[PDB]
Structure formats: structure tokens, C-alpha cells
Amino acid sequence: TPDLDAIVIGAGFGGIYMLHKLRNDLGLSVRVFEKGGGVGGTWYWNKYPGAKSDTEGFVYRYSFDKELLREYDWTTRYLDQPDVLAYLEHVVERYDLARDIQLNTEVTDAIFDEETELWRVTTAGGETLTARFLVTALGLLSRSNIPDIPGRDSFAGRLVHTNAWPEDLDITGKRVGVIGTGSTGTQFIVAAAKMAEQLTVFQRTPQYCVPSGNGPMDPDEVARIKQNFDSIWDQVRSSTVAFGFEESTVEAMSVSESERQRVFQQAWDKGNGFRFMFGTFCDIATNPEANAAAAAFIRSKIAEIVKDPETARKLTPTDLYAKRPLCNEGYYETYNRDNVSLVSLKETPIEEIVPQGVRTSDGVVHELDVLVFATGFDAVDGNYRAMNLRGRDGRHINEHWTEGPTSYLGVTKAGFPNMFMILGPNGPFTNTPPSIEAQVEWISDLIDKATREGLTTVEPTADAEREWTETCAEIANMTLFPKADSWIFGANIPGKRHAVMFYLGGLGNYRRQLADVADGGYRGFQLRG
Amino acid sequence: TPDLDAIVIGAGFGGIYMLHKLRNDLGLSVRVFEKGGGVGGTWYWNKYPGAKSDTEGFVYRYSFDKELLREYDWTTRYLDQPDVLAYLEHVVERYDLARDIQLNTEVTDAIFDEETELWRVTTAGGETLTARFLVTALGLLSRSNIPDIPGRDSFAGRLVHTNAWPEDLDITGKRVGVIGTGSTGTQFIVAAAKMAEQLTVFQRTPQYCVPSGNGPMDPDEVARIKQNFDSIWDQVRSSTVAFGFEESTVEAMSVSESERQRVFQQAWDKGNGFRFMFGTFCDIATNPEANAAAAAFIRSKIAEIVKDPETARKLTPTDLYAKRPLCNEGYYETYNRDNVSLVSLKETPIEEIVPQGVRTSDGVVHELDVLVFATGFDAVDGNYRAMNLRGRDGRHINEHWTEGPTSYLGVTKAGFPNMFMILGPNGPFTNTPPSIEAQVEWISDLIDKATREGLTTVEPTADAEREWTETCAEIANMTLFPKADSWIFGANIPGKRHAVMFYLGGLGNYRRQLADVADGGYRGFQLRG
Ligand SMILES: Cc1cc2nc3c(=O)[nH]c(=O)nc-3n(C[C@H](O)[C@H](O)[C@H](O)COP(=O)(O)OP(=O)(O)OC[C@H]3O[C@@H](n4cnc5c(N)ncnc54)[C@H](O)[C@@H]3O)c2cc1C
Ligand SMILES: Cc1cc2nc3c(=O)[nH]c(=O)nc-3n(C[C@H](O)[C@H](O)[C@H](O)COP(=O)(O)OP(=O)(O)OC[C@H]3O[C@@H](n4cnc5c(N)ncnc54)[C@H](O)[C@@H]3O)c2cc1C
Ligand SMILES: NC(=O)c1ccc[n+]([C@@H]2O[C@H](COP(=O)([O-])OP(=O)(O)OC[C@H]3O[C@@H](n4cnc5c(N)ncnc54)[C@H](OP(=O)(O)O)[C@@H]3O)[C@@H](O)[C@H]2O)c1
Ligand SMILES: NC(=O)c1ccc[n+]([C@@H]2O[C@H](COP(=O)([O-])OP(=O)(O)OC[C@H]3O[C@@H](n4cnc5c(N)ncnc54)[C@H](OP(=O)(O)O)[C@@H]3O)[C@@H](O)[C@H]2O)c1
Ligand code: NA
Ligand code: NA
Ligand code: NA
Ligand code: NA
Ligand code: NA
């Protein structure tokens, strides 16, 4: 007899829906443990100015409740962090979830007991509880990456990671430095430039930023979108990246030079990063000649927008357009402001952080009241490797992951029975919520089967997991994503294994893999009862 | 304007009473942050078998409320951990405190903002709140000391510190090892011997354990004590150690051999560790001749009780009787059992922890299922030094404490305005609760003065703190305590500064110092409005 049927870790998009399925639909005893002081995951932690969705609001939400789809209003094309947090708090209120979500509670240990065949979970607060089923919704992009830049801790001002933005901090009229120009840094830079006395950007690697097209939502369009939600979610679930647009089936180099310029300009004008990469042509991420045409178009727009030719050059990337697409409102324009300076760390790397700011290699001391680390995440496997997480024969998850992190179907792990992962290693690379929905519903169905049939353990075989690794490696190596040095393949952190950590076959093909496994009596699983 | 009048850290005896004064009596807005999953401090964390008070139950409790003194019942002469925890849970219940205690919440940062003159507090859960007043009840004996014994992490069974004892762990019928024989180790050994198939004790330093005389309380005795509580508490508050017995005023060597034997035998039969040290003669802990006579009596008792002469030899300490007194029921008798073995780490030290147990320098592999670290605490300063705690000029508490931890009166710190410590460095060495009450009441009185008069800051001067260090040094250096290597002077942890960390003048003289300062216009404080 376990203390609980199920323990879920994380109260983001993943954990919130998992608890709903397990407690509300299956009638099981469940507790969520969230180490944060509120629910919302991403949208609790990322309180920094400019924090917002790069999925358009209309499809950055749950689809499973048709009444919620009819009722809930959004006012902006992309959702500000406070509005996403408000939406998730509403979902929690709507299904009476708060009473079974324990906040401020870090799970430090999860130990599979091979005698009882129960999960023994320990918290930082010194609670030990047993559960039959463990669901880890720990976040692909949850564990803060804070590089050990020499002197970092000497800084006399406010030093923060974006994923730890403190609620009291007001940068209005302060001298602000930011390190990093990914999705976090660039949206922060647009907002911060309006507030700061001076904003200094420390950029190691410029990215191919495209317009978001963000602005007010016409409430009459929101009514029409709501009219067509059934067909919109149909298209989302059958797409690769699930961003709510029809993906191009046209090869970039199959059309005229004129047509390529027109298609790119039309996506530039319409906005969205995933639209630019996948709504232009079908081979931007696979054909290197297609990739170079897309990259060239983005460089041409930078040269048009940025007035200082030195700033233009430093903003203009020359590497593969194969990092995760990013978009913003008025990013390049921000660098035309009198109070924004760009420091290329390619030219003048950081030598040392000092009480008064940042000394770069040219010996210039950038005087700062606030230093912001927009330096990203120990992505995918970060919160797994930091946990004392042990399966059969008492083996730690790290012992299994010496060649990079692994899974079966992105949701299970050989040697870890009755353990399910929401966006574990080697799952889909998409607009997040519909991928979360696919995993949570499939996991719920298998937990319901194990309940009805009296199954004591369900686990994938080592062979099924190895074949899933091979399937992900085969798909990945036909794209340019492995040659971009991003968080996606673990190349953002010194000493992290460069490895496939996603199934890159898209939501459509991912959903088919899940369905065929379930159809075939849970192919690759040993079900015991 | 702060978010809260006061933030309190810790929900042991100290934080609970401090919240009661500030919320219930002064009517301030207050929150307690406790990183533990429940209230009780010591009595939450120490879930190990045998865990119990070495203060007799009648005075191991609050005195401030006559109604609670009249009502609450205890059934054993010493309080088992579940019974002390239930008492503290009842206190939280009856005083309506739970609504203002936030569990699972570790304070990572407390930063004095010199511009606002407010404390900025950050939680591991990502809350930042401001308070005018900060009270740290972090515990003298709260931060677990776990030595880096070679191969420790390789142990294949259940390895636990006593202060992290997991609720699920049943040692019944298992091969158990324990490292340590202080108050924790010895009370655990008595309880664990009745459960374990085999209990191996890894003893580096045997101590002068005396009988507790624990057993059932006659309910007529409890009724008798409650009728006399006013005179019992008056004697406690003007005593030195506050254990509820009259302290001897007779010099051990001023009486005959026969009288020394009679007085020692009397204390031995009556029981209690502090009774033996301070209830026999006035100079056991100050006069090395008196110390020797007390030590010799205890050794003679070990020889009587322990049947195997080799075991008796290993149990018999030959160093100063100048570590904290410790008492148990049937400790030496436990070693007459067939399932208890004693390893002297003086003779055969631990060379390595291996998957199957412990290898001593005699090459013996001790085979264990469970390895218990009864290795004590980073005492007094542990939880302060681990905090990002900063005062005036942005200085970390560590920068103030390079020659050991310091305070003014054990409750304030120079450079740290509006910050108060419950059992901070250089406070009393007593039965805990009456010392906690003296400090909480003094702190409440000064916060109440500060509120009434509109004071923005209260702080001790550097000079007042330096004088308090010297006072504590003068008193400490007239005792044998500094000559014996124990947690009391920081000598239990490699690399930790050997320094005075207590005022050893006793509760009566400590209370006089607090009163003289307050009545004398807060001598040594700068009060600012
Ligand atoms: C600023 C920002 C904007 C983004 N915008 C988009 C977007 O527009 N579109 C998109 O598709 N994706 C976006 N993402 C990616 C984003 O991660 C997902 O959209 C989604 O929010 C993730 O939900 P989740 O529940 O999987 O994880 P999270 O929201 O990260 O939740 C995981 C939770 O687990 C908790 N946790 C982890 N380990 C433990 C532990 N051991 N014990 C207890 N709790 C633990 C964490 O505290 C966290 O709250 C964005 C990310 C960021 C940072
Ligand atoms: C087994 C045992 C028995 C004892 N018996 C006796 C006895 O009989 N008589 C006696 O006089 N003394 C005894 N002691 C000493 C004991 O410490 C005190 O009696 C008393 O319990 C201490 O109360 P406190 O509130 O000062 O500290 P604690 O009870 O230690 O409470 C401090 C709390 O602060 C919390 N905390 C610390 N840092 C942070 C942070 N950064 N954020 C959030 N929370 C934090 C900790 O989690 C802890 O719960 C005993 C100790 C032990 C271990
Ligand atoms: N618009 C949105 O909705 C939004 C916003 C925030 C984040 N997100 C999500 O979160 C993901 C992560 O984005 P992110 O911007 O937080 O992280 P990221 O994409 O990994 O970017 C981190 C940035 O920090 C830099 N950096 C890392 N280590 C450094 C070091 N030692 N010195 C200097 N610079 C260093 C990186 O440069 P290098 O390339 O040289 O390593 C890069 O510019 C996104 O891809 C997206 O999925 C979304
Ligand atoms: N009321 C009670 O019954 C009770 C019970 C528990 C604790 N307490 C309180 O808590 C305090 C702490 O007592 P405690 O027993 O937890 O700790 P302690 O008195 O500090 O004892 C620690 C023990 O561990 C040993 N040890 C430490 N490091 C070691 C190492 N590296 N290798 C081997 N042995 C090692 C010590 O021996 P060395 O000295 O040789 O290193 C000692 O025997 C008590 O003094 C008391 O105030 C009270
Ligand atoms: Na909200
Ligand atoms: Na996603
Ligand atoms: Na089974
Ligand atoms: Na000792
Ligand atoms: Na005894």
C-alpha cells in the first residue's frame, strides 16, 4: 500500500494537466511537489521585463477543455508572462488543484524500492512518501545555467539570472548589463532599453531574430478564432511544430530568386520565428542552400534597420540558421537608441566581473548597477541529473546517461518502472502545450490500464529504449540542428555531452509513434500483474 | 514601507514563541519561514529511535502561559521526540500560529538595504519580501555535520544522519552501524539494540554517560509539580543551567572522600547529566581536581556494569569530564547484550566506507544494511554562514566572523541593524526553553519600543560587540570546557575556528545583563529616528 497512487513533480503546464488527469479523471490519490513558491513553472520564475510567449496566444494554451477554449480571452497576439501565469492559476482554480499542489517543496530523492515495487520520494523539507506511479514534469528549460565567469560573486550590485528575476527589482534609470542574446536576452533587451539609464549587451553569438508581429488582438478576431478552434487544433496536432500555421511543402531552391525574396518578405511582415523557418519553404532546416537563402534574407533586414555600420556588423550572424527560431517586436531597432551599446565578446571577451561591473579583454570596465544572466538552461536533463534518481539494481539515472540522456518515446525510461516523464529526453520539439497534452493523455491511459488490470509494474525494455535513441539520431542527422552549437544538443555548457536530446520528427509523427505503441499492446513494454 | 513588519526564520521552540509575541501580543504583520516540512525544529528532524529530551519533562516546555502549564500533561520523566513534537504542534494550534508559518521555505538571502533601511529576504522558492525586523532562530544544533569519510557515498544500503532520520526506515532485524557517542548516538544505541539483528558502535571518543533515571511519571507527581510551577520557574530563571534542580554551592575537595562518594552516588541514583555536573559540587567544570574525582566515580560505575572487561575498557573515557553532560536509561547495560559490538576508532579507525559496510584499520569489513551518522552539528554558526546574510557596507556575516562567530548579548550583531538572533553566538548554555523565553521577550520589548517611538533602526556598536566577546572569553577561560575538544568551541569539524561561542555565566547572570542593558537605555545600542 503506497501513501499515494501517484506523485507528480512540477506545477508548470506539464504537472498541472497531469494532476488533473490522475486525480480528477482517474480518481487516484495524487500530490504535486513544486519547489517554487507558486504554480506556473516557466511563467512563475521568468518575472523579467519583456518575458512573453513566442507561440502566438491563440495556440499557447490547453485544448482539452472546449468550455475553457470558448470562455478565456487574450488581448495581445503574444502572451505576457503575467497573463500566462494568470491563465494557469485559472486552470488550477477551475479544477480545484491548489489543495493537492505542495509549493516550496523540492524533491531531492526518488528511489525505486525493488522489494515493494513502490517509489520512495524524499523532499528537502524531510518528508518521505511512497507512490506506485511517479511523473517527472521537471521542465526542458527549468534548471538555470549560471556560468562561473571569474569574479562573478564580487559584483556589488543586483546580479540575477532571468529564470530567478526577483519581483522587487526595478531597473528604471539604472545601468543594466545583460549577458546572452537568445529568446530570453533579446525580449529582455527590447523591454529593458525603455527603462534603463543605460543598457550594455554582452553578446558572444548573434542570432537570426525575425519580427514577432506582436500587437493588440482584435476582440472580433478572438471570437472568430474561438468559432474555428476544433479545426485549428486538428491542424496543430497533425503538423510538425504545432505553431498554428500551415507549414510550407515548397523547396526553397525550386522557385525563382524573386519568389524566394517575396516568400521571406511575406513571413517577415506576418511575423513569428517558427513561421520564418517552416512557413516559408519545407527545407530551411535540412537543405544547406535553403538555410543560406533564409539566413541571407535576415542579414539584409539587419543592414536595412541598424544605422551604425559597426553595430549592424556585430548584430549580423554568419553561422547556420539552425538554433531554435526566435522573434521579438523591434529588437534590431532597439540598438538605434542612444542608451544601448553592443559589446561583441568575440572581439572583447569578459575577463572578470568586478564590484562595479564587468571588465572586458580591452580593459574597459562597464559600470553597472544590475548584471542580468540571460545565459539559458541546463536543458532537458538538468533537473533529472541533479536529483538522487535511482531505478532497478539501485542505479542512478546518471549511470544510464553516460552517452547523453535517453528515454523510450520521451515519456518512459528502461530500469525505471512506473516512472513517466512530461517532456523527458528524446521527445517532440514543438509549441509546448499540445506536445504536453499528447504525453499526459497517453501516460494517463497507461496508468488507467495498470489500475483496471492490477498491473504492479510497467517499464520499457533496454532494447526498445536503444532503438528509440537510434530513431532520434537518424532523424536529427538529416537536419542542420546538430551543427548550431545550442542548448538543443547540450553544447551551451562546458563539459556537457553533445548528444541528440529531441525526437525531431514533429508532433504529427510523434503522436503516430505513441498511438502505434499503445495499439500494439504497448510494444517495447513489460506489463506485469 | 515593508511587505511585513517582521520576518522570523525557523519554527523550533525559538521561532514559534517569537511569532507568538510579534503577531499575538504586539499585533505586527509577521511571517515565519521554516525549510522543514513541519514545525518543531529539533523535534521535527530527529525522528530516530530513542530520540528524547535530556532536560526532565517538567521544565522542558514554555513557562510564559499559566493556562498551558495548568492544562498540558506529560507521562514520562523525559519527553520522547513524538511527545515534544505534539506539544509544539499544540502550541501552534492553540495560539493560532499556523496561518503565519510557511513550511518547506528556506531563506537563501537576507540583505540589509541601506537606502530603505529594510531587510530584503529571498526564499529558495523565488519569493522576495521586505521586512523592517528580521529574527533568525536558525538553531545552535540544526546544521547536520556529515564527515567526508573516504568512500561514504559508495555505501549500498541506507546511509542517514540522525538529524535526517527518514520516517519510513525500520531498522528492525537489520545489521546497523552508528558513528558517534554523544547525546544522539547513545540514546539511539539504547533504542536500536532492541530492534537491530546486530548493532556495531563506531566510537572515537567515549563520554561520561550517567543515568537519566527516566521512567513513567506518577500522575500525582505531575499534579504536585503543577501546584508548584510558580516556585519551580522562579528557581529555573535565577539558576545557571535552568534544569529545575538546586545547584551545589560546595567545593568538591572541601569535603571528605566519604562525602564525595555519597554525593556522587546520590546524583547517580537520582539521575540527569546536568544534575551530576552542577547538582553535586559547585566546581566540577572549573576545578581540574574536582573534575578528576567526578570522572573517576563514573569510570568505577562502568567497571561494575559492563561484564566483558575489554568492552568496559573501550567504554571508559580517560579525558576531561568537560563535554556537555549526557544521560541515558540503560546505556552501559546495552553493551551486555549479544547483538551489540563496540569498535574503538582510537585503536581501529575507519579507513573506508564500502558498498557492504565499513573497513577499520585492522582490515575488518563490518557488514551493514544501515549506516547511521550520529556525528552532530556545525553548531551555533552553521545556518548563519550558509545563508547569503549581508549587513551595512554589503558585508557578508562571514567577513565579521573570521576569528569565530560574534554577537552583542547573543541576540544582536554589529553591522546588522533591526536583526535579532534567538540563540545566536555568545548566548547562554542552559536548558533551552527558559533561555529562548528570556531572548524572545527582550527582543519583543525592543521591537515594541522601536514601533512606539518610530525608530527606523536599532543596532549594537562594534565596540559593544567586542566588549561582549571579551566578557564571554574571560568567563569561558575560568572553566575546563575550552580544554576539551567538542562542538561547544567548534573543535568537532576539521578547519572550523576554535573559539568561544557561548556566554557560560548561566541564565541568572545572562538575564541580569539583558535587564541592565534595557533598563540602562539600551547601553551599547545606537537607536535612530
Ligand atoms: C521565457 C520563456 C518563454 C517561453 N515561451 C514559449 C513559447 O512561447 N512557446 C513554447 O512552445 N515554449 C516556450 N517556452 C518553453 C517552456 O518551457 C514551455 O512552453 C512550458 O512552459 C514548459 O512547461 P513544463 O511544465 O514542461 O515545464 P516548466 O514550466 O519548466 O515547469 C517545471 C517545474 O518543475 C519544477 N521542478 C523541477 N525540478 C523539481 C524538483 N526536483 N522538485 C520540485 N519541483 C521541481 C520547477 O520548479 C518548474 O516549476 C518558453 C520558456 C521560457 C523560459
Ligand atoms: C535529539 C536532541 C535532543 C535535545 N534535547 C534537549 C534537551 O532535552 N534540553 C535542551 O536544553 N536542549 C536539547 N537539545 C538542544 C535543542 O536544539 C534545543 O532544545 C531546541 O530544540 C532548539 O530550538 P530552536 O528553535 O532554537 O532551534 P531548532 O529547533 O534547531 O530550530 C531551528 C529551525 O530553523 C530552521 N532553519 C535554519 N536555517 C533556515 C533557513 N535558512 N531557512 C529556513 N529555515 C531554516 C531549521 O530547519 C530548524 O527547524 C536537543 C537537541 C537534539 C538534537
Ligand atoms: N520568446 C520566448 O518565448 C522565450 C524567451 C525566453 C526563453 N525562451 C525559451 O527558452 C529557451 C532558452 O532561451 P534563453 O535565451 O534563455 O537561452 P539560450 O537560447 O541558451 O541563450 C543563452 C545565451 O547566453 C549566452 N551565454 C551562455 N553562456 C555564456 C557565457 N559563458 N558567456 C557569455 N554568454 C554566454 C549564449 O551565447 P552562446 O550561443 O555563445 O552560448 C546565448 O546568447 C529558448 O530557446 C526558448 O525555447 C522563450
Ligand atoms: N536530549 C538528548 O537526549 C539529546 C540527544 C541528541 C542530541 N542532543 C543535543 O545535540 C547535541 C549534539 O549531540 P550529538 O550526539 O548529536 O553530537 P556530538 O555531541 O557533537 O557528538 C558527535 C559524535 O560523532 C563523533 N564524530 C564526529 N565526527 C566523526 C568522524 N569524522 N569520525 C568518527 N566519529 C566522529 C564524535 O566523536 P569525536 O568527538 O571523536 O569526533 C562524537 O562521538 C548534544 O550535545 C545536545 O545538546 C541532545
Ligand atoms: Na496571477
Ligand atoms: Na516546447
Ligand atoms: Na510487478
Ligand atoms: Na566527542
Ligand atoms: Na547505564
Give the contacts of A200 (CB within 8 A, at least 6 positions apart).
A175, A176, A177, A178, A341, A343, A358, A366, A368
DSSP string of A500-525? --EE-SHHHHHHHHHHHHHHTTSTTE
From chain B, the residues in CB contact with A125 under 8 A are 35-38, 103-104
**What is the CB < 6 Å shell around ligand 3?**
A 53-54, 141, 147, 179-185, 187, 204-205, 324, 345, 374-377, 487, 492
What nine digits make up the cell of A164? Answer: 530567478
Tell me how crowded residue B485 is: count the other CB atoms within 10 A of its CB.
Answer: 16
Please name the residue that has the C-alpha cell 520512495.
A120
Q: Where are the alpha helices (DSSP H) in B37-120?
A: 42-45, 66-71, 81-94
Give the contacts of B393 (CB within 8 A, at least 6 positions apart).
B114, B415
Residue to substitute in B54, B142, B212 for testing ligand 2 pocket (most ligand atoms within 8 angstroms of CB):
B142
Q: Are strands A357-360 and A350-354 parallel, antiparallel or unpaired?
A: antiparallel
B10 backbone φψ class: left, alpha, beta (φ>0; ψ -120 to 50): left
Q: Which of B364, B342, B368, B359 is nearest to B185 (CA)?
A: B342
Tell me how crowded residue A73 is: count the other CB atoms within 10 A of its CB.
Answer: 11
- Secondary structure (3-state) at B159: strand
Are A81 and A51 in contact by the 8 Å Cβ rule? The answer is yes
Query: Is residue B168 classed exposed, middle or buried when 0-12, 13-18 and 19+ CB atoms within 10 A define those classes?
Result: middle
Are B325 and B284 in contact by the 8 Å Cβ rule? The answer is no
Are B21 and B28 in contact by the 8 Å Cβ rule? The answer is no
Q: What is the CA radius of gyration of chain A?
A: 23
Q: Which of B18, B93, B87, B82 is nearest to B58 (CA)?
A: B87
Cβ contact, residue pair A44, B120, below 8 Å: no
- Between CA A386 and CA B207 the distance in angstroms is 39
End-to-end CA gap in chain B: 15
Tell me how crowded residue A470 is: count the other CB atoms within 10 A of its CB.
Answer: 11
Q: Which atom of ligand 1 is nearest to the CA of A386?
A: 41
Residue of A44, A128, A156 lying closest to B126 (CB–CB): A44
- A346 CA to centre of own chain: 27
Q: Which of A354, A509, A153, A119 is nearest to B109 (CA)?
A: A153
- C-alpha dihedral sign at A79, A83, A88, A91: negative
- Between CA A42 and CA A25 the distance in angstroms is 25
Cβ contact, residue pair B37, A105, below 8 Å: yes
What nine digits make up the cell of B103? Answer: 513550511
Are B136 and B10 in contact by the 8 Å Cβ rule? The answer is yes
- Between CA B276 and CA B279 the distance in angstroms is 6
Phi and psi angles of residue A402, each rounded to the nearest 5 degrees, phi first: -70, -25
What nine digits make up the cell of B25? Answer: 501580543
Give the contacts of A2 (CB within 8 A, at least 6 positions apart).
A118, A119, A130, A131, A132
Give the contacts of A505 (CB within 8 A, at least 6 positions apart).
A240, A428, A475, A513
Q: Whose CA is nearest to atom 8 of ligand 4?
A: B183
Tell me how crowded residue A345 is: count the other CB atoms within 10 A of its CB.
Answer: 15
What nine digits make up the cell of B310? Answer: 575489554
- Between CA B341 and CA B358 the distance in angstroms is 14
What nine digits make up the cell of A421? Answer: 516523464
Amino acid at A235: Q
DSSP string of B5-23? EEEEE--SHHHHHHHIIII
Angle B418-B421-B425 from CA coordinates, rounded to 5°: 125
Using alpha carbons, list the distances in angstroms from residue A141 to A126, A490, B72. 27, 12, 52
- Secondary structure (3-state) at A193: coil
Q: Are strands B457-460 and B525-528 parallel, antiparallel or unpaired?
A: antiparallel
Label each residue of A12-62 as H, E or C: CHHHHHHHHHHHHHCCCCEEEECCCCCCCCHHHHCCCCCCEEEEEHHHCCC
Bridge partners (DSSP) listed for residue A4: A131
Helix (H) or strand (E) holding A276: helix A273-278
What nine digits make up the cell of A119? Answer: 517509489
Bridge partners (DSSP) listed for residue B246: none
Please name the residue that has the C-alpha cell 560574534.
B406
Q: Å resolution of this model?
A: 2.1
Q: Whose CA is nearest to atom 51 of ligand 2?
A: B42
Are B295 and B208 in contact by the 8 Å Cβ rule? The answer is yes
- B71 CA to centre of own chain: 27
Are B375 and B364 in contact by the 8 Å Cβ rule? The answer is no
What nine digits make up the cell of B481? Answer: 570546557
Give the contacts of B188 (CB within 8 A, at least 6 positions apart).
B48, B49, B50, B51, B162, B178, B372, B374
What nine digits make up the cell of A43? Answer: 511563467
Q: Which of A45, A113, A119 is nearest to A84 (CA)?
A: A45
From chain B, the residues in CB contact with A161 under 8 A are none
Q: How far is A148 from chain B (nearest CA, A)?
A: 18
Chain discontinuities in chain B, listed by preceding residue (C to N exceeding 2.5 Å): none
A219-227 and A229-238 helices, crossing angle to 10°: 70
- Between CA A203 and CA A181 the distance in angstroms is 6
- Between CA A237 and CA A234 the distance in angstroms is 5
- Between CA A95 and CA A289 the distance in angstroms is 50
Tell me how crowded residue B27 is: count the other CB atoms within 10 A of its CB.
Answer: 10
Are B104 and A102 in contact by the 8 Å Cβ rule? The answer is yes
Tell me how crowded residue A523 is: count the other CB atoms within 10 A of its CB.
Answer: 14
Label each residue of A293-350 as H, E or C: HHHHHHHHHHHHHCCCHHHHHHHCCCCCCCCCCEEECCHHHHCCCCCEEEEECCCCCE
**CA-based nearest residue in chain A for residue B127:** A37
Are A61 and A33 in contact by the 8 Å Cβ rule? The answer is no
Amino acid at B206: P
Interface mutation vs chain A, best among B104, B153, B399, most A CBs within 10 Å:
B104
Q: Which of A528, A506, A412 is nearest to A114 (CA)?
A: A528
- Secondary structure (3-state) at A144: strand
- Secondary structure (3-state) at B101: strand
Give the contacts of A338 (CB within 8 A, at least 6 positions apart).
none
Torsion of CA B81, B84, B89, B95, to 10 degrees: -170
A with B: how many residue pairs have Cβ under 8 Å apart? 63
**CA-based nearest residue in chain B for residue A2:** B168
The CA A154 to ligand 4 mean position distance, Å, reads 37
DSSP string of A103-130? TT--EEEEEEETTTTEEEEEETTS-EEE
Are A323 and A486 in contact by the 8 Å Cβ rule? The answer is yes
Phi and psi angles of residue A166, each rounded to the nearest 5 degrees, phi first: -80, 140
Task: Decide whether any atom of ligand 2 lies within 6 Å of the B42 Cβ.
Answer: yes
- Between CA B409 and CA B365 the distance in angstroms is 49
- Between CA A195 and CA A173 the distance in angstroms is 6
- C-alpha dihedral sign at A147, A153, A159, A161: positive
- Between CA A318 and CA A321 the distance in angstroms is 9
Query: Is residue B363 classed exposed, middle or buried when 0-12, 13-18 and 19+ CB atoms within 10 A define those classes?
Result: exposed
Cβ contact, residue pair A106, B124, below 8 Å: yes
Q: Whose CA is nearest to atom 53 of ligand 2?
A: B42
- Between CA A209 and CA A282 the distance in angstroms is 19
Cβ contact, residue pair A128, B44, below 8 Å: no
- Secondary structure (3-state) at A167: coil
Label each residue of A260-273 as H, E or C: HHHHHHHHHHHCCH
What nine digits make up the cell of A358? Answer: 564587468
- Between CA A343 and CA A100 the distance in angstroms is 48
What nine digits make up the cell of A271? Answer: 511575423
Using alpha carbons, list the distances in angstroms from residue B337 to B174, B192, B196, B341. 16, 12, 11, 9
From chain A, the residues in CB contact with B43 under 8 A are none
Cβ contact, residue pair A168, B394, below 8 Å: no
Residue to substitute in A142, A204, A348, A371 for testing ligand 3 pocket (most ligand atoms within 8 angstroms of CB):
A204
Are B92 and B98 in contact by the 8 Å Cβ rule? The answer is yes
Burial A483-511 (b: 16+ CB within 10 A, else e): ebbbbbbbbbbeebeebbbbbbbbbbebb
- Between CA B334 and CA B337 the distance in angstroms is 6
Using alpha carbons, list the distances in angstroms from residue A357 to A369, B113, B468. 7, 19, 38
Cβ contact, residue pair B102, A105, below 8 Å: no
Are B494 and B302 in contact by the 8 Å Cβ rule? The answer is no
From chain B, the residues in CB contact with A44 under 8 A are 126
Tell me how crowded residue A400 is: count the other CB atoms within 10 A of its CB.
Answer: 19
Query: Is residue B490 classed exposed, middle or buried when 0-12, 13-18 and 19+ CB atoms within 10 A define those classes?
Result: buried
Query: Is residue B6 classed exposed, middle or buried when 0-12, 13-18 and 19+ CB atoms within 10 A define those classes?
Result: buried
Q: Which of B63, B69, B192, B162 is nearest to B507 (CA)?
A: B63
Are A10 and A92 in contact by the 8 Å Cβ rule? The answer is no
Ligand nearest to the CA of B376: 4
- Between CA A135 and CA A348 the distance in angstroms is 45
**Residues constituting chain B:** 529
Bridge partners (DSSP) listed for residue B210: B327
Method for structure elucidation? X-ray
Are B503 and B405 in contact by the 8 Å Cβ rule? The answer is no
**CA-based nearest residue in chain B for residue A33:** B104
- Between CA B200 and CA B194 the distance in angstroms is 13
A432-453 and A506-519 helices, crossing angle to 10°: 10
Bridge partners (DSSP) listed for residue A452: none
Are B44 and B85 in contact by the 8 Å Cβ rule? The answer is yes
Bridge partners (DSSP) listed for residue A332: none
DSSP string of A386-455? TSEEE-GGG-BHHHHTBTB---BTTTB-TT-TTEEESS-TTEE-S-HHHHHHHHHHHHHHHHHHHHHHT-
Are B183 and B374 in contact by the 8 Å Cβ rule? The answer is no
- Considering only CB atoms, which residues of chain A are within 8 Å of chain B? 35-38, 44-45, 102-106, 120, 122-128, 130, 156, 164, 166-169, 394
Q: Where are the domains of chain A?
A: 1-147+378-529, 148-377
Are B91 and B43 in contact by the 8 Å Cβ rule? The answer is no
Please name the residue that has the C-alpha cell 543560406.
A292
Q: Are strands B175-179 and A370-373 parallel, antiparallel or unpaired?
A: unpaired
Please name the residue that has the C-alpha cell 552539528.
B377
What nine digits make up the cell of B46? Answer: 530527529
Cβ contact, residue pair B126, A164, below 8 Å: yes
From chain B, the residues in CB contact with A166 under 8 A are 122, 126, 128
DSSP string of B283-342? -TTT-HHHHHHHHHHHHHHHHHH-SSHHHHHHH---S-S-SPP-EESSHHHHTTSTTEEE
Q: Whose CA is nearest to atom 29 of ligand 4?
A: B375
Q: Which of A157, A215, A191, A173 is nearest to A47 (CA)?
A: A191
What nine digits make up the cell of A511? Answer: 503522436
Amino acid at B117: E
What nine digits make up the cell of A368? Answer: 553597472
Are A146 and A160 in contact by the 8 Å Cβ rule? The answer is no
Query: Is residue B491 classed exposed, middle or buried when 0-12, 13-18 and 19+ CB atoms within 10 A define those classes?
Result: middle
Please name the residue that has the C-alpha cell 504497448.
A522
- Between CA A294 and CA A277 the distance in angstroms is 8
What nine digits make up the cell of B130? Answer: 521586505
Q: Where are the alpha helices (DSSP H) in A155-256?
A: 183-192, 219-227, 229-238
- Secondary structure (3-state) at B175: strand
Are A410 and A384 in contact by the 8 Å Cβ rule? The answer is no
Amino acid at A25: D
What nine digits make up the cell of A499? Answer: 548528444
Amino acid at B482: P
- Specify the DSSP class assigned to residue B202: E
Are A340 and A172 in contact by the 8 Å Cβ rule? The answer is no
Cβ contact, residue pair B36, A125, below 8 Å: yes
Are A145 and A490 in contact by the 8 Å Cβ rule? The answer is no
Cβ contact, residue pair A167, B103, below 8 Å: no
- Specify the DSSP class assigned to residue B154: G
